[PDB]
Amino acid sequence: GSHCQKTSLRVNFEDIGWDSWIIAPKEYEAYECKGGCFFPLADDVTPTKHAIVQTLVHLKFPTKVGKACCVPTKLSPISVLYKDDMGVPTLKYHYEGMSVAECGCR
Amino acid sequence: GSHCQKTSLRVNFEDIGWDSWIIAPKEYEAYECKGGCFFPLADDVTPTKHAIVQTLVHLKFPTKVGKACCVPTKLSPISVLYKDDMGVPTLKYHYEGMSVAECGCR
Ligand SMILES: [Cl-]
Ligand SMILES: [Cl-]
Ligand SMILES: [Cl-]
Ligand SMILES: [Cl-]
Ligand SMILES: [Cl-]
Ligand SMILES: [Cl-]
Ligand SMILES: [Cl-]
Ligand SMILES: [Cl-]
Ligand SMILES: [Cl-]
Ligand SMILES: [Cl-]
Ligand SMILES: [Cl-]
Ligand SMILES: [Cl-]
Ligand SMILES: [Cl-]
Ligand SMILES: [Cl-]
Ligand SMILES: [Cl-]
Ligand SMILES: [Cl-]
Ligand SMILES: [Cl-]
Ligand SMILES: [Cl-]
Ligand code: NA
Ligand code: NA
Ligand code: NA
Ligand code: NA
Ligand code: NA
Ligand code: NA
Ligand code: NA
Ligand code: NA
Secondary structure: OOEOEEEOOEEEOOOOOHHHOEEEOOEEEOOEEEOEOOOOOOOOOOOOHHHHHHHHHHHHOOOOOOOOOEEEEEEEEEEEEEEOOOOOEEEEEEEEEEEEEEEEEO | OOEOEEEOOEEEOOOOOHHHOEEEOOEEEOOEEEOEOOOOOOOOOOOOHHHHHHHHHHHHOOOOOOOOOEEEEEEEEEEEEEEOOOOOEEEEEEEEEEEEEEEEEO
16 A cells, blocks of 8 residues: 655755755755555545545546645744844744645645 | 646536435535646745745656645535434535635645
């Protein structure tokens, strides 16, 4: 079974062009949600009714409707050292929505 | 621009095998979230920071990381007439998570 779950994704800020304002860290663990949303479903996939219905419609009309998507359903913050307006290193202690805490089918 | 938004999807319960317990309605408007999550983004796409970061990593490593996904971010209920344990038609007034209220990139 190849289902919806959290897997590693280490993100280098230089690589996405955010080194222009993030001094540190260089890299972080963002994680990614990977996996299929198909029947039979897993139990920590926490599907909405809509995701279930859509997956079923896709099974019957695959060319016309896509299947539900394995996505983050909860995110966590990281700390970033960034450059203030004046250019001063300023800590953002809780920089929200940066790392995957949980995945599910939506 | 071809971006993340709500589009129609009319779902017939016979077609997804739920006619075994749903007496009515026959069909409903579930809606679906369709569209790309790419730069430049729209304004009602309400992307998480994670979705932004991931889309950027995908742009630089397309074979290795997928892009963010246009998915429902808010759902609404519908009413369904279903069959009780004893077989009696019972109304479920607010049957949650059934129809798309809003879409965004996640
Ligand atoms: Cl399986
Ligand atoms: Cl299942
Ligand atoms: Cl739900
Ligand atoms: Cl849920
Ligand atoms: Cl298919
Ligand atoms: Cl979220
Ligand atoms: Cl803390
Ligand atoms: Cl903070
Ligand atoms: Cl923040
Ligand atoms: Cl455009
Ligand atoms: Cl943008
Ligand atoms: Cl966010
Ligand atoms: Cl948000
Ligand atoms: Cl690409
Ligand atoms: Cl939701
Ligand atoms: Cl009401
Ligand atoms: Cl109810
Ligand atoms: Cl419910
Ligand atoms: Na089809
Ligand atoms: Na998916
Ligand atoms: Na999310
Ligand atoms: Na949090
Ligand atoms: Na690549
Ligand atoms: Na998508
Ligand atoms: Na949702
Ligand atoms: Na609601």
